[PDB]
């Protein structure tokens, strides 16, 4: 009980989420949206009881309330935790972080899942996972529901009418060959929707200090599971050369097969050119990204960061008409974290995006996220 209490943590987060969206047609505004919401996030994580098999429990209290634009939404979640040696089993509310499932947390409240998961690190450098998710609790929702696949746009994903799934199975692993090179292999199956094999290779190469080249290479094969037409290969890689407080990144992404990339509806796709508005994951879509980061600590104003990126996509199959679909997006992020004063740790982040296409709706979008986390101890 010494670790249980001592490793235990609790916190309350205040979270303010604002966004506006302007649909552009010609050089004019066709329509606008605005959402404003306040969040209260209560988190608790126990440590583990002593012994061969340790037990712990996590609890989550998420409350969202629309400020303007059911008014109240959110969820309460409990998770039982078991740990033997270096293997941990979790049952209940899960938020896995894997190439085959990246839960959304870009709005007010996180997307969460119900199920059971196993993470294992018994062997030096080897990390294994496996699990089953049964239900998803979307970010704007109040309870748990069957999962579906991300559809729409020109993804050209087609599914049996009314189809839903209460089984997403996953298993995988990753191995650190050196402290600079790891590879990963991950499997995910959304029952009746798709099967997916994800391969990864991450290489960080220090030229000197402080200079580094990170190579992030990825490849996923997705295939149908009886009741969809899913058929996709996704090659996507990012190269990020870091020097001092600058980082310059280049990304490449290519869809092929009869549909775009397959991923749980509501989640984020693990793709290098997935950005603020577009995922550039339509049928046949190829896209290139250029990204620049600067961290103002490099001078005066620690806690202030800048980021901008540009992504250009083409070769999109328009599906019902001939011709090449093209789209492009530019993002600009500015983020500040108070380093001192009574406001310390208060976080504020502005995310700005422009999306333009030659075939569908264009819009601009601004997000302001204000965040403050207070430990209860």
Author numbering: -1 to 67, 87 to 394
Question: What's the paper's own text on this?
Answer:
In such microorganisms, the majority of small molecules are taken up by members of the OprD outer membrane protein family. As expected from pairwise sequence identities that range from 35%–50%, the Occ proteins share a similar architecture, with a slightly off-center constriction formed by the inward-folded extracellular loops L3 and L7 and residues in the barrel wall. The transport data demonstrate that Occ channels have a pronounced preference for substrates with a carboxyl group, due to the universal presence of a basic ladder on one side of the barrel wall.
A comparison of the crystal structures suggests that the division into the OccD and OccK subfamilies occurs on a structural level as well; the OccD subfamily members of which structures were determined have much smaller pores than those of the OccK subfamily. The pores of the proteins within the OccK subfamily show a considerable variation in size and shape, suggesting differences in substrate preferences within subfamilies as well. These data are consistent with the fairly large pores observed in the six crystal structures of members of this subfamily. OccK channels, on the other hand, appear to be less selective and facilitate passage of a wider variety of substances, with a preference for cyclic compounds.
